[PDB]
Design a protein around this nucleic acid. Structure first.
Ligand SMILES: Nc1nc(=O)c2ncn([C@H]3C[C@H](O)[C@@H](CO[P@@](=O)([SeH])OP(=O)(O)O)O3)c2[nH]1
Ligand SMILES: [Mg+2]
Ligand SMILES: [Mg+2]
Ligand SMILES: [Mg+2]
Ligand SMILES: [Mg+2]
Lengths: 176, 176
DNA sequence: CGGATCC
DNA sequence: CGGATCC
């Protein structure tokens, strides 16, 4: 897939917001715009993008086997490179050029952890995770853990998570 | 990529044996037939194949960065799905149809370990590796290890390795 | 079972 | 740093 500008990326996401769905035992189920979050370098507002990253919030655990493996995009040509329940990489046709669209799934209880992880950048995550690791924690896209056990934080948003973990909140574009 | 018969697989490999090369800083370097080993289900003589698996023996460590990342196949149309120094998955055109060709690299000192690993089947490797793990060993495609340290076995062929590890030698078709 | 490539 | 999907 080719490289994209920030504006092209934003246009693609806007187009996708009303056109994503999945087939669930023969029933086409629309994915709601409020359950679609732009993540990756697009959310970080980088000028050129290697691809478009979208996080899909899935309301029930039982649906994970169905959402990405039966993804549908109304009116857009695409093919599937790799796909499972948690990551699906698509090549899409947009204005006669091919681009990479990366789809990820999070459960509702994972959402802020997923947003934080998929926003990156990678260097920033490594640093954050290394610091938490010194205190016997493990942070991933699913939660904060200690001794392989979920640490139940009383948080809803990404901003609350970042502050609860003991770090300075920064807007996605200023994370490093 | 589509499914193949064993005889189609054998025909593809035969065709490839004289046509594989890599570009090394602008220089086309032929890969020799003696350094190309059929592995996977093809070596196990299964009647249908999901793909063709080839192991390429690379004579120097410095070449690993060049071989698969600059692979060339004379006269054959192909595209690259994923590729690094150790695994490269290609989709090739053969007669009217697209098939998957999986390429792997081993260094000369790894060869018997690589052949054993890439022959499979997976179930057989799991069983073998589980048994070795009980005795505090780790077996992979690169060597036999204990406490993260290479166990220098005095072996050259796959048959010698299998017997040295304490298992019954079986021909690839009879491994399970 | 264990590793490669990719996110 | 940590995990997904694939070999
Ligand atoms: N240790 C180990 N774990 C695995 O999951 C695994 N998957 C594949 N392989 C090795 C053995 C296979 O014969 C070879 C080629 O990969 P394929 O998926 Se084309 O398997 P095959 O159907 O046997 O041709 O790589 C594996 N080896
Ligand atoms: Mg991206
Ligand atoms: Mg991406
Ligand atoms: Mg195979
Ligand atoms: Mg294969």
């Amino acid at each position: 897939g080719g490289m994209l500008t920030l504006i092209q990326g934003k246009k693609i996401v806007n187009h996708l917001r009303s056109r994503l769905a999945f087939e669930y035992n023969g029933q086409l189920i629309k994915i709601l715009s409020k359950n679609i979050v732009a993540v990756g370098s697009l959310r970080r507002e980088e000028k050129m993008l290697n691809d478009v990253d979208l996080l899909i919030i899935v309301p029930e655990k039982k649906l994970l086997k169905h959402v990405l493996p039966n993804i549908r995009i109304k009116g857009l040509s695409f093919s599937v490179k790799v796909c499972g329940e948690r990551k699906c990489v698509l090549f899409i046709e947009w204005e006669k050029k091919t681009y990479q669209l990366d789809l990820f799934t999070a459960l509702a209880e994972e959402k802020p952890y997923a947003i934080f992880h998929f926003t990156g950048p990678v260097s920033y995550l490594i640093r954050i995770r290394a610091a938490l690791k010194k205190k016997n924690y493990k942070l991933n896209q699913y939660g904060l853990f200690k001794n392989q056990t979920l640490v139940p934080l009383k948080i809803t948003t990404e901003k609350e998570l970042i502050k609860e973990l003991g770090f300075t909140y920064r807007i996605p574009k200023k994370r490093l």
